């Protein structure tokens, strides 16, 4: 843990907010190294009963080493808060990039999907499933490279564990919203949802209510606007399969002709 304390850092501006994570820019006083401190309130973690998720986030993320996965350097705590020491992502979230641009072109989409597929291939090689691949958890590095972050819902495959109860269902596959046993194929479904949202500007199963969203996901009810190309329609339709066993391997996504034709690499 390298015996860190709050007094070793100078805190800066807020970088973002999560349900539990309050994230700030920070500088280690001696080295001047810039990082991010994810601050969590012990009383709120205890009330919600999410201590096990925090333990998994720290245990899983601290051991991953990949350029498209955000590093977790360490942690410390005081009487009321837990502090996670994270690699700072200077270009913000893919969530904000999408609000600004409205929709991404095919080259930007394919490049993000490749980076996501490479990070997930590394995770899956260790049987680590992320399960919370959503644009607010995809951060951007100094070279504009995508970094997977927020490992709070991560687990070792297979799992029957529930995630959110009232939160966004938009990125979750049918087997997760139904409470069934699931594995690595959960991240392949989220990849298809992201590919669709990047090109269209909204996720495929979006609805005004929780029940209607649930209905659309369980029945896999989505249509493409006219501007979506054949190659993108083909990849998205292969990823958004109700049967998880029918979803492609990550190597099949990385070699898909629409991906190799449009990724910047
Ligand atoms: N290292 C970072 N660099 C820059 N911004 C960050 C960083 N980590 C998080 N953020 C910003 O803070 C927001 C909240 O962080 P995070 O996703 O880790 O919290 P959370 O959603 O509350 O966590 P959890 O789902 O584990 O309970 C992110 O969506 C992003 O906007
Ligand atoms: O009772 C506590 O002090 C407490 C500690 C921690 C904790 C300590 C070291 C590393 C990590 Br990760 C977490 N977490 C708590 C929590 F999540 C809720 C309530 C109390 C604690
Ligand atoms: Mg988050």
Curated annotation (Swiss-Prot):
This protein's gene is called AURKA
Active site (record annotation): 132 (proton acceptor)
> Which E.C. number(s) belong to this protein?
2.7.11.1
Q: Where is this cross-link: Glycyl lysine isopeptide (Lys-Gly) (interchain with G-Cter in SUMO2)?
A: 134
Upregulation:
Expression is cell-cycle regulated, low in G1/S, accumulates during G2/M, and decreases rapidly after.
Q: Which GO terms describe its biological process?
A: anterior/posterior axis specification; apoptotic process; cell division; centrosome localization; cilium disassembly; G2/M transition of mitotic cell cycle; liver regeneration; mitotic cell cycle
Gene Ontology molecular function, alphabetical: ATP binding; histone H3S10 kinase activity; molecular function activator activity; protein heterodimerization activity; protein kinase activity; protein kinase binding; protein serine kinase activity; protein serine/threonine kinase activity
Its family? Belongs to the protein kinase superfamily. Ser/Thr protein kinase family. Aurora subfamily.
Q: What is the effect of changing residue 31 to R?
A: In a colorectal adenocarcinoma sample; somatic mutation; reduces interaction with TPX2
Query: Sites of the modification Phosphothreonine?
Result: 163-164
Group of enzyme by EC: transferase
So which domain of life are we looking at?
Eukaryota
- The main place the protein resides is cytoplasm
- The name under which this protein is listed is Aurora kinase A
User: Listed GO cellular component terms?
Assistant: axon hillock; basolateral plasma membrane; centriole; centrosome; chromosome passenger complex; ciliary basal body; cytosol; germinal vesicle
Explain the purpose of this protein.
Mitotic serine/threonine kinase that contributes to the regulation of cell cycle progression. Associates with the centrosome and the spindle microtubules during mitosis and plays a critical role in various mitotic events including the establishment of mitotic spindle, centrosome duplication, centrosome separation as well as maturation, chromosomal alignment, spindle assembly checkpoint, and cytokinesis. Required for normal spindle positioning during mitosis and for the localization of NUMA1 and DCTN1 to the cell cortex during metaphase. Required for initial activation of CDK1 at centrosomes.
Q: What is the reaction catalyzed?
A: L-seryl-[protein] + ATP = O-phospho-L-seryl-[protein] + ADP + H(+); L-threonyl-[protein] + ATP = O-phospho-L-threonyl-[protein] + ADP + H(+)
